[PDB]
Design a protein that fits this description.
Blueprint: E1 2-7, E2 15-19, H1 26-37, E3 46-47, H2 60-67, E4 70-73
Parallel strand pairs: 1-4
Antiparallel strand pairs: 1-2, 3-4
């Protein structure tokens, strides 16, 4: 599965596209995205477009199924 993750704290709203196995934990996606954007992995969070936090203790496939592939990192 491909996630498009947008960093909102940079006003240009850069995004990265990440390819992740469905059964990989979403914790890994949060970590990778944080690394890609050079933001601290331990304080960062992935949210929906309404600002709701995604609990990363679930598979990437589950997150895609429930909330789609376009998310934001804060």
């Amino acid at each position: 599965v491909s996630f498009k993750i947008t960093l909102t704290s940079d006003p240009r709203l850069p995004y990265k596209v990440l390819s992740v196995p469905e059964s990989t934990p979403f914790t890994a996606v949060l970590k990778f995205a944080a690394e890609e954007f050079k933001v601290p992995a331990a304080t960062s969070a992935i949210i929906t477009n309404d600002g709701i936090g995604i609990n990363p203790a679930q598979t990437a496939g589950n997150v895609f199924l429930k909330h789609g592939s376009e998310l934001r990192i804060i």
